[PDB]
Amino acid sequence: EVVKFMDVYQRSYCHPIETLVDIFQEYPDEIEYIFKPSCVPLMRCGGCCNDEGLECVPTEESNITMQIMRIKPHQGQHIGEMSFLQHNKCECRPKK
Amino acid sequence: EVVKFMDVYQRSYCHPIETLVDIFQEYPDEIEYIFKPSCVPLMRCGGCCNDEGLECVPTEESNITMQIMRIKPHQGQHIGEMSFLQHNKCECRPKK
Amino acid sequence: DPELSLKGTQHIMQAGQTLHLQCRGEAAHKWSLPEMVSKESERLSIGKQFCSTLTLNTAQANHTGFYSCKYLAVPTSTESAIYIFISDTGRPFVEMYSEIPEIIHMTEGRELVIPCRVTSPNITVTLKKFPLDTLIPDGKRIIWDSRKGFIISNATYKEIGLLTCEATVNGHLYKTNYLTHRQTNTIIDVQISTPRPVKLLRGHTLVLNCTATTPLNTRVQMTWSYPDEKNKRASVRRRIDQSHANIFYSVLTIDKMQNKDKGLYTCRVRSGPSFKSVNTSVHIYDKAFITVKHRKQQVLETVAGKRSYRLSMKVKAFPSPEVVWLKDGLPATEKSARYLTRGYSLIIKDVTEEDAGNYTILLSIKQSNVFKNLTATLIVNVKPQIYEKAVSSFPDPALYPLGSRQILTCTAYGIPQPTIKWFWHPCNHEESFILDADSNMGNRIESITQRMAIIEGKNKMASTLVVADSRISGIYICIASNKVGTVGRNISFYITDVPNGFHVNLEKMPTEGEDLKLSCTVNKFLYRDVTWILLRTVNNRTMHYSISKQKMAITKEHSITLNLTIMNVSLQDSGTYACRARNVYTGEEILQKKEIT
Amino acid sequence: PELSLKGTQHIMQAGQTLHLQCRGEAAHKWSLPEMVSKESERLSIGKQFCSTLTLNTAQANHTGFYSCKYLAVPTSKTESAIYIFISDTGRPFVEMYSEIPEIIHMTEGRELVIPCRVTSPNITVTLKKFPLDTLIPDGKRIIWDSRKGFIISNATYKEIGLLTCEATVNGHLYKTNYLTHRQTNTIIDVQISTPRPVKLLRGHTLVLNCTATTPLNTRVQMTWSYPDEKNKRASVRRRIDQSHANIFYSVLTIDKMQNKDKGLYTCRVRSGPSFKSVNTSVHIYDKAFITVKHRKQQVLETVAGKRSYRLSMKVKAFPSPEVVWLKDGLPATEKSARYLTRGYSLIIKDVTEEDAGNYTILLSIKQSNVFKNLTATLIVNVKPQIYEKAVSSFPDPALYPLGSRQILTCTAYGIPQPTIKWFWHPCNEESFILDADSNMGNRIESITQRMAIIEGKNKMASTLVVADSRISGIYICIASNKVGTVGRNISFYITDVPNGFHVNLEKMPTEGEDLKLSCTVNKFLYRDVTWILLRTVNNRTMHYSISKQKMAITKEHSITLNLTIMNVSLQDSGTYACRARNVYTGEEILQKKEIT
Ligand SMILES: *[C@@H]1O[C@H](CO)[C@@H](O[C@@H]2O[C@H](CO)[C@@H](O)[C@H](O)[C@H]2NC(C)=O)[C@H](O)[C@H]1NC(C)=O
Ligand SMILES: *[C@@H]1O[C@H](CO)[C@@H](O[C@@H]2O[C@H](CO)[C@@H](O)[C@H](O)[C@H]2NC(C)=O)[C@H](O)[C@H]1NC(C)=O
Ligand SMILES: *[C@@H]1O[C@H](CO)[C@@H](O)[C@H](O)[C@H]1NC(C)=O
Ligand SMILES: *[C@@H]1O[C@H](CO)[C@@H](O)[C@H](O)[C@H]1NC(C)=O
Ligand SMILES: *[C@@H]1O[C@H](CO)[C@@H](O)[C@H](O)[C@H]1NC(C)=O
Ligand SMILES: *[C@@H]1O[C@H](CO)[C@@H](O)[C@H](O)[C@H]1NC(C)=O
Ligand SMILES: *[C@@H]1O[C@H](CO)[C@@H](O)[C@H](O)[C@H]1NC(C)=O
Ligand SMILES: *[C@@H]1O[C@H](CO)[C@@H](O)[C@H](O)[C@H]1NC(C)=O
Ligand SMILES: *[C@@H]1O[C@H](CO)[C@@H](O)[C@H](O)[C@H]1NC(C)=O
Ligand SMILES: *[C@@H]1O[C@H](CO)[C@@H](O)[C@H](O)[C@H]1NC(C)=O
Ligand SMILES: *[C@@H]1O[C@H](CO)[C@@H](O)[C@H](O)[C@H]1NC(C)=O
Ligand SMILES: *[C@@H]1O[C@H](CO)[C@@H](O)[C@H](O)[C@H]1NC(C)=O
Ligand SMILES: *[C@@H]1O[C@H](CO)[C@@H](O)[C@H](O)[C@H]1NC(C)=O
Ligand SMILES: *[C@@H]1O[C@H](CO)[C@@H](O)[C@H](O)[C@H]1NC(C)=O
Ligand SMILES: *[C@@H]1O[C@H](CO)[C@@H](O)[C@H](O)[C@H]1NC(C)=O
Ligand SMILES: *[C@@H]1O[C@H](CO)[C@@H](O)[C@H](O)[C@H]1NC(C)=O
Ligand SMILES: *[C@@H]1O[C@H](CO)[C@@H](O)[C@H](O)[C@H]1NC(C)=O
Ligand SMILES: *[C@@H]1O[C@H](CO)[C@@H](O)[C@H](O)[C@H]1NC(C)=O
Ligand SMILES: *[C@@H]1O[C@H](CO)[C@@H](O)[C@H](O)[C@H]1NC(C)=O
């Protein structure tokens, strides 16, 4: 009935987990388009190092191409292939 | 090699997804303890509604119990069962 | 009016077949088609009744829809229509969106029509809303129509997403997807920050803001219109207030600024129908600008006693200077406590003659060591003031002995150097100047001369009017007046014919039984109600007597006289006699005399 | 101290018994790794001392450093040591932490020891870091010891986390978990906002803020020390600056405040060893508080010409009032544009005699409509100033005919109304003069002062009346009040001859007669007296001479120069003049023409 401590710890340590990134954060330059879907699921660094001095930073990355719908106001609509960064491996490092 | 459009829309639509919530955000009154792990994986509403007038809010919630390690400064540390909120179903509703 | 071949509103047809339609009328007929292919099908048209026909080669499911023969091809001018259903064992949807769904611009609260129409009217189509939801048509809010699709009255928020129409034919499941997308396009307002004519240095960096405000579900396209060619970069970004509002930012940046870059810059926010354009100007070329002029420097000539006097001077400078004001040199800065600043102005509250001086001002633009001073001279006018008026001369209602040289002085000072002048006025029972021969004659005028004496720290100027022979009673008025004010003082110049105005002519008596002749001489008009008193007292009872039983009173200008004569003075008719003379200027003046025979 | 089991190592299984001896002379102290309770026993007995130690059964949790200490003698300020291992076919670890790891307080940069010791010295143990790391002992920075554990030199950041030791025994893998926890305890400083003694109403709400500062990996525990009993709530929270800094807030709230709630409140920040406590006070119960006193009102007496004068008054009020200053009444507010406010004060720039009047001050506390006006009268002293000093009387240092009545006057003004007094100074030393003084200088007729209102000011003018001018003096009139003094010198030279510079003429009948001329020159002005003859033809004049050596009759007052010529003919007659210089001025000369 109660979740075990070993599972809670390992599932919460610094590791690449699926995070829902808003596209506008990744591309703040294209302000004339309405993206659908406005968010994309990407494998990014999530979790906690259980130490206020350390931070969960990536050590190995890669990009993945997805098909995002671009809706220009009253001026046509088309489908475009856009790139999105992903994190393959994360690790705890000092911030300063 | 390129992810199709329909896969991106479904995997990013407003649905309960596993999120790593910082424990301090859910319990800011117990500031005399150092918790390990500092974050816990929780099923919270993630994703976009593809409409700036809609917000991904929960419609069905539940409570879950996890074993978290509580560390008091220089005066002993004990294991405790802390409870957190989770989301079973999410829906897009108008904001405010 | 338009007669059609296939009578009715419904029709059945299969794939690979052909269409054969007629439309007989009088004038030409216009054929309304749901989808005109191209050079695929054919058409022709030929008492004598005009007949119009329409053919088709092969049969494709894409041509399901409204087939109408319009008889409106006449400017003076009914319409017939019928649905052609072209079916196929897969796929039975007219427009099939398997991979990419079709976008449907909609609006909350209005009507929404899903264009998933099928071929057979007996096809059962299920409508699903992602993620897991199904809309059941009821005939009122949700209506099903195998010719158009799904009709939704009052579209709430639950219809904003990915809709899918599904149908099952021959044990196989097909589905088409539609993506309702609410969107407006209302460019509310734009603003460039700041709208001021920006100034910069030849070599500085220009950074311009442009803010755009739109409601939810809408974008903009912002651009900058500069006169030169491709200079440097220009970033953009978007920010949301979450209420409901969108804000778009446009940051133009030119790292290398030159003289050619000077011109007009217009932020042009476009979004299709709605458009706005906010513009602003930019000046440059300047390097270290400090140029200060004034208005009438430096002949500033205020007058003392002025309340709230205000100097100023125009300052053309770039950038902002640090201004400090000075007076007679020197630091100054605000040494006199008063005199406020601000506004590149020099405001004196209450002006005094100690405020004169060449007011200097130091304008300091730091970060480049560029200062500029400027001198402006202030002169304060004082207005004249006679000092003889300040002194309270007790003696007197001034009278003078007859035939006497008298000297009268008036001392005054002011800026500019005032001018003095004397006049005249008798009394008897509109003025003229007086000099060294004037003015037939008032009094025998001798010398009127002024001199420059330095007394009390000021270089004052005093005039002296010297009468050589006072004969007639007058009033010599001295007046001092420069160009900013006037002040005069009238000097009362009476004249007495008798010692010090009051006299008692004493003609005594040899012995008992003789006579007494007393005479009281009173001046013109300074003692009135003249009388005679006698005293004599035995212990503490005293008091006065009389008078006034004649003989009259002879008024002789100048100075009246009172003659009293007593006949046969005995031992009791002689004591202490006095002349009592009342007055209105200041009360009482009595002159006594005691003699006994 | 000799032990029974010779050596440092020992082999033993589970369920067996321990038997160790320690023969010597004095008592021995036994050092054990784990001390249970009422399980085993021990005892101790020419006659040689001997100590022993037994054990019943055997468990893996009783394995480690066993030593016989011969240090139980104060004079002995030699020790034996031996390792005892208890093996088992089940758990090979002494400290079994399988589900929940054991916490290890460590510090980055220093030494770190992993206490996963086993029972058999031949068991190969592997240390791994979560999740895909394995530390390999190198014998230098990382050394493995089957009795102690893992020794890490200079523990970097890559060792703060979940570590695990693993070992395989008879094809069965066992593992124990440890958790290195970097933690400090440096309660830097605390601060209550605001440190001011807070004032409130009977029934208001008390809000207190206490802030703590610590570095990273550290907490605090904040509490409020209030005098009364359980009042209301108190919320706490935490904020991270992410450098390295942690901030801790503590909000105390008492919605229902009463008279008893007044007291001292102390924020106590405890975290074990270090402790901090900052205190502050709170006042209450005031309903509507306005009380204004001053310094020396309302007899404020300043002097004209004062630079940077200042008034003041003490104001006991609550809450913050709106203070507006007034003058002669009335609005005012800053009507004279000068002056200044600020500080419940009234600083005057430069004081003039027009600055008098009842200065009012209105203290307005809004939100309750509680106003309090206050009158404050100011009287400005003016100091005396004799106005006759300014007027330039041209008539050259006045000389008066002998035996003539003269009258003088001095007018002065000031606040308070100043007083005058005359003096005397002869010329061959001052004398207060009255109506019978001062034997006698010159015969004084009357000295009387008056109060005349001229030039808008209520001035005062005194008049000294010389009844009979006889001696040359210098009357001084001195005007003075209680804030200043000023005097005016009345130049009173005196002459005996009409208007000074007289020529006594005694002509001659006809040719052959005598001439007697006398020139009288006033006192000691017109120096260098002499005579002059002159006769002109065409455009030429010129004077003549003199001197007949008739020098030099001086007399107080007025000197004389008598020129006498005996037996004048026709050519010894012409135009005779008396030429005398002068001081200050400005030469004079008086002519006379006669021919015989
Ligand atoms: C459109 O949305 C609804 C549907 O009619 C209206 O709001 C209320 O909706 C509930 C159920 O959703 C109905 O029971 C009420 O009768 C509706 N109220 C009213 C006043 O109709 C909403 O008003 C509709 N607005 C428009 C412009 O059609
Ligand atoms: C060492 O471990 C043994 C494991 O056998 C423990 O002994 C047990 O302790 C519990 C605690 O009350 C008792 O209820 C049991 O009866 C004990 N024996 C057994 C076989 O379980 C204990 O932790 C340690 N014992 C000693 C002597 O060191
Ligand atoms: C795509 O990959 C490239 C290469 O690393 C990276 O620069 C870019 O940021 C990625 N896309 C996004 C949206 O981050
Ligand atoms: C879960 O349980 C807690 C019990 O303290 C209760 O407040 C609420 O139902 C839930 N709270 C959270 C934070 O999940
Ligand atoms: C629809 O597309 C074209 C004509 O538009 C035609 O080649 C095709 O056969 C039509 N029917 C189907 C089922 O694609
Ligand atoms: C379709 O449904 C209508 C409804 O009455 C029926 O009349 C018609 O025969 C049906 N068509 C087929 C092909 O089943
Ligand atoms: C321009 O807008 C941004 C976004 O709000 C702001 O941070 C920046 O300060 C603005 N620049 C100026 C010069 O106002
Ligand atoms: C720029 O903005 C002003 C302000 O409304 C407007 O009057 C003007 O027409 C705009 N365009 C130009 C070229 O000045
Ligand atoms: C003072 O002002 C006069 C008036 O023109 C000017 O000539 C002179 O240079 C000034 N001197 C100083 C020291 O400012
Ligand atoms: C301005 O004043 C400064 C210091 O008083 C002096 O160094 C400088 O030469 C002055 N400039 C001019 C133009 O008088
Ligand atoms: C003369 O002096 C009196 C002072 O009482 C004044 O009222 C009057 O105006 C003066 N005469 C003239 C002509 O100013
Ligand atoms: C006064 O007395 C003389 C002396 O006898 C006399 O001559 C004279 O008439 C007397 N006066 C009168 C008025 O009678
Ligand atoms: C400990 O960590 C690494 C070991 O190489 C080194 O960078 C660091 O300086 C060491 N610390 C000290 C104090 O030597
Ligand atoms: C105390 O801190 C809280 C935290 O937000 C703040 O709202 C409040 O204004 C603070 N009170 C004072 C008196 O500073
Ligand atoms: C309050 O703080 C002061 C600060 O020095 C301290 O001396 C005192 O002991 C504290 N406690 C009180 C006054 O109860
Ligand atoms: C100041 O005193 C005057 C003296 O008459 C009196 O009218 C009043 O009480 C006070 N306030 C004023 C004049 O505003
Ligand atoms: C003083 O203030 C009170 C305000 O309550 C009011 O009576 C009036 O404004 C003032 N009264 C006097 C006598 O100045
Ligand atoms: C007035 O005369 C006295 C006599 O010695 C002298 O001391 C004083 O200085 C004189 N007054 C002035 C203003 O010089
Ligand atoms: C002058 O003349 C008179 C006239 O008679 C004569 O007596 C006298 O002797 C002469 N000489 C002198 C020195 O008076």
XYZ file of C-alpha atoms in Angstrom, chain D residues 66-393:
328
model
C 39.071 -6.670 20.608
C 41.829 -5.369 22.869
C 43.176 -5.886 26.396
C 44.174 -2.498 27.810
C 46.892 -2.473 30.477
C 46.237 1.268 30.928
C 44.066 0.933 34.055
C 46.924 2.303 36.184
C 47.459 6.058 36.735
C 51.231 5.497 36.800
C 51.216 3.477 33.546
C 50.545 6.626 31.475
C 51.474 -1.292 26.435
C 48.212 -2.582 24.953
C 47.328 -5.810 23.156
C 44.899 -6.041 20.248
C 43.352 -8.870 18.230
C 40.615 -9.159 15.602
C 37.736 -11.580 16.187
C 35.561 -12.593 13.223
C 32.290 -14.531 13.421
C 31.263 -16.008 10.066
C 27.896 -17.364 8.947
C 26.260 -19.050 5.965
C 23.484 -16.435 5.868
C 24.470 -12.783 6.273
C 28.166 -12.000 5.645
C 27.900 -8.355 6.741
C 28.109 -7.046 10.289
C 25.988 -3.955 9.511
C 23.113 -5.118 7.299
C 21.373 -2.196 5.561
C 19.420 -3.749 2.681
C 16.126 -1.836 2.555
C 17.047 1.503 4.164
C 20.689 2.634 3.823
C 22.634 4.044 6.747
C 23.312 7.795 6.814
C 26.933 9.004 6.750
C 27.596 12.643 7.643
C 30.589 13.674 5.545
C 32.284 16.774 4.174
C 33.553 17.529 0.682
C 37.335 17.620 0.345
C 38.251 15.711 3.515
C 38.471 11.993 4.319
C 35.595 9.556 3.937
C 35.367 6.026 5.350
C 32.783 3.487 4.159
C 32.012 1.104 7.097
C 30.927 -1.966 5.135
C 33.198 -4.424 6.893
C 32.726 -8.151 6.328
C 33.423 -11.232 8.472
C 35.761 -13.323 6.290
C 39.007 -11.587 5.213
C 38.982 -13.437 1.865
C 35.593 -12.098 0.712
C 35.992 -9.814 -2.309
C 33.823 -6.702 -1.897
C 33.000 -4.218 -4.665
C 31.996 -0.596 -4.025
C 29.626 0.954 -6.573
C 28.137 4.427 -6.970
C 24.574 4.885 -8.161
C 23.799 4.127 -10.854
C 26.473 3.103 -13.396
C 29.700 3.735 -11.465
C 32.101 1.366 -9.701
C 34.985 2.611 -7.561
C 38.102 0.447 -7.940
C 40.497 0.552 -4.945
C 44.009 1.584 -5.983
C 45.809 1.242 -2.632
C 46.606 4.972 -2.423
C 43.664 7.381 -2.623
C 41.151 4.530 -2.186
C 42.256 1.639 0.046
C 40.226 -1.475 0.856
C 40.363 -3.090 4.302
C 38.356 -6.185 5.213
C 38.395 -5.110 8.884
C 37.731 -1.366 8.453
C 36.169 -0.770 5.024
C 36.864 1.738 2.245
C 39.155 4.710 2.925
C 38.822 7.616 0.481
C 41.401 10.410 0.454
C 40.062 13.854 -0.498
C 36.349 13.114 -0.927
C 35.252 15.104 -3.988
C 31.680 15.819 -5.095
C 31.430 12.521 -7.037
C 31.047 10.647 -3.734
C 28.018 12.485 -2.293
C 25.104 10.144 -2.952
C 24.048 6.507 -2.684
C 26.946 4.061 -2.314
C 26.653 0.292 -2.007
C 29.055 -2.535 -1.159
C 28.451 -5.898 -2.846
C 29.920 -9.346 -2.203
C 29.258 -12.854 -3.531
C 29.366 -15.860 -1.181
C 28.509 -19.380 -2.411
C 26.849 -18.073 -5.562
C 24.615 -15.769 -3.496
C 24.965 -11.996 -3.898
C 24.477 -9.774 -0.843
C 24.563 -5.978 -0.668
C 24.414 -3.245 1.984
C 23.556 0.384 1.232
C 25.007 3.611 2.619
C 24.124 7.262 2.025
C 26.727 10.031 2.232
C 25.071 13.244 3.428
C 27.018 16.489 3.076
C 25.662 18.778 5.798
C 26.911 21.801 7.772
C 25.372 23.936 10.514
C 26.365 27.607 10.212
C 23.489 29.804 11.383
C 25.025 32.958 9.867
C 22.785 35.780 11.084
C 19.174 36.614 11.915
C 17.210 39.841 11.615
C 13.704 40.953 12.605
C 11.958 43.428 10.282
C 11.522 45.942 11.505
C 13.716 46.278 14.621
C 11.629 49.304 15.676
C 9.349 49.061 18.731
C 6.024 48.440 17.006
C 2.930 50.347 18.146
C -0.625 49.195 17.418
C -4.266 49.645 18.430
C -6.212 47.653 21.012
C -7.707 45.160 18.558
C -5.299 45.494 15.606
C -3.208 42.676 14.104
C 0.449 42.109 15.013
C 2.724 41.100 12.116
C 6.344 40.117 12.759
C 8.980 38.958 10.258
C 12.102 37.018 11.274
C 14.711 36.167 8.647
C 17.520 33.624 8.997
C 20.589 33.060 6.810
C 22.531 29.795 6.430
C 24.800 28.288 3.753
C 23.943 25.171 1.783
C 22.878 21.793 3.176
C 21.556 23.197 6.447
C 18.228 23.960 8.130
C 17.019 25.976 11.124
C 14.082 25.759 13.510
C 12.475 29.107 14.277
C 10.170 29.884 17.199
C 8.658 32.977 18.817
C 8.909 33.711 22.547
C 5.771 35.627 23.561
C 4.800 36.445 27.164
C 1.093 35.575 27.001
C -0.590 32.226 26.355
C -1.690 30.709 23.026
C -2.656 33.715 20.888
C -2.949 32.923 17.163
C -1.084 31.295 14.265
C 2.496 31.544 13.010
C 3.570 30.378 9.548
C 7.114 29.541 8.445
C 8.632 29.018 5.003
C 11.940 28.722 3.128
C 13.551 30.295 0.058
C 16.691 29.369 -1.882
C 18.803 32.000 -3.628
C 19.476 29.504 -6.436
C 25.830 30.613 -5.463
C 25.375 29.121 -1.985
C 22.765 30.673 0.306
C 19.550 29.609 2.048
C 16.948 32.028 3.402
C 14.377 31.174 6.078
C 11.286 33.280 6.790
C 9.128 33.120 9.916
C 5.865 35.077 10.069
C 4.111 35.598 13.406
C 0.519 36.829 13.347
C -1.849 37.714 16.194
C -5.205 38.744 14.714
C -6.791 39.572 18.093
C -4.441 41.940 19.927
C -5.269 43.137 23.446
C -3.595 45.038 26.290
C -1.969 41.864 27.601
C -0.289 41.175 24.257
C 2.098 44.057 24.951
C 5.529 42.677 25.745
C 8.777 41.326 24.340
C 8.933 38.955 21.374
C 12.111 36.970 20.703
C 12.877 34.987 17.552
C 14.903 31.891 18.487
C 16.774 30.107 15.674
C 18.179 26.796 16.937
C 19.926 24.086 14.915
C 21.806 22.041 17.511
C 25.243 23.371 18.480
C 24.965 26.953 17.209
C 22.099 29.142 18.432
C 20.835 32.660 17.658
C 18.137 34.824 19.224
C 17.106 38.369 18.324
C 14.496 40.250 20.349
C 12.190 43.211 19.806
C 9.377 44.903 21.711
C 5.750 45.691 20.884
C 3.512 48.379 22.403
C -0.276 48.609 22.138
C -3.570 49.883 23.678
C -3.253 53.430 22.318
C -6.576 54.627 20.877
C -6.007 58.161 19.520
C -2.622 59.617 20.429
C -1.769 63.303 19.951
C 0.239 65.176 22.594
C 2.325 68.224 21.657
C 4.576 70.118 24.054
C 7.570 72.310 23.244
C 10.802 73.791 24.599
C 10.176 77.327 25.928
C 6.876 78.398 24.350
C 5.627 80.862 23.969
C 8.275 83.394 24.911
C 10.435 82.835 21.833
C 12.574 85.997 21.712
C 15.063 86.133 18.825
C 17.110 89.043 17.474
C 17.023 90.529 13.985
C 19.862 89.589 11.666
C 19.902 86.064 13.115
C 21.182 83.507 10.614
C 19.696 79.985 10.711
C 17.313 80.408 13.638
C 15.234 77.385 14.615
C 12.065 76.681 16.575
C 11.096 73.248 17.843
C 8.466 71.354 19.806
C 8.129 67.771 21.043
C 5.194 65.750 19.688
C 3.942 62.513 21.245
C 1.627 61.081 18.592
C 0.428 57.863 16.949
C 0.235 57.129 14.082
C 2.245 59.316 11.686
C 0.651 62.790 11.552
C 0.534 65.409 8.821
C 2.266 68.525 10.174
C 1.667 71.925 8.556
C 3.212 75.123 9.928
C 1.489 78.506 10.081
C 2.388 82.149 10.758
C 0.166 84.810 12.373
C -2.491 82.263 12.017
C -3.364 81.667 9.357
C -2.959 79.290 6.403
C 0.075 79.881 6.244
C 1.702 77.755 4.841
C 5.073 78.665 3.410
C 3.816 82.142 2.539
C 7.160 83.887 3.059
C 8.820 81.295 0.743
C 11.807 81.371 3.110
C 11.913 79.411 6.375
C 11.661 75.609 6.279
C 9.753 72.762 7.900
C 10.823 69.158 8.611
C 11.457 67.663 12.038
C 8.472 69.083 13.966
C 10.575 72.231 13.766
C 10.503 75.663 12.159
C 13.937 76.830 11.027
C 14.029 80.543 10.109
C 16.493 81.542 7.391
C 17.239 85.196 8.176
C 15.199 86.990 10.818
C 13.724 90.451 10.271
C 11.533 92.544 12.566
C 8.536 91.587 10.399
C 8.847 87.900 11.356
C 6.887 88.392 14.589
C 3.422 86.973 15.222
C 1.571 84.002 16.713
C 2.992 81.083 14.731
C 0.319 78.380 14.681
C 0.958 74.679 14.013
C -1.771 72.214 12.984
C -1.055 68.484 13.395
C -3.610 66.497 11.389
C -3.958 62.749 11.959
C -6.422 61.595 9.303
C -8.267 58.241 9.160
C -9.790 59.250 12.523
C -10.398 63.007 12.165
C -8.137 63.960 15.092
C -6.622 67.434 14.672
C -4.744 69.546 17.222
C -3.818 73.195 16.626
C -1.187 74.991 18.707
C -0.291 78.673 19.052
C 3.332 79.789 19.397
C 4.130 83.501 19.636
C 7.445 84.847 18.328
C 8.811 88.310 19.174
C 11.804 89.588 17.196
C 14.238 92.056 18.729
C 15.395 94.784 16.367
C 18.379 96.373 18.208
C 18.734 100.176 18.206
C 19.675 102.255 15.192
C 20.013 106.046 15.302
C 18.449 107.364 12.122
C 20.195 110.734 12.287
C 23.481 108.946 11.584
C 22.441 108.218 7.985
C 21.378 111.735 6.936
C 24.378 113.680 5.654
C 23.987 117.173 7.111
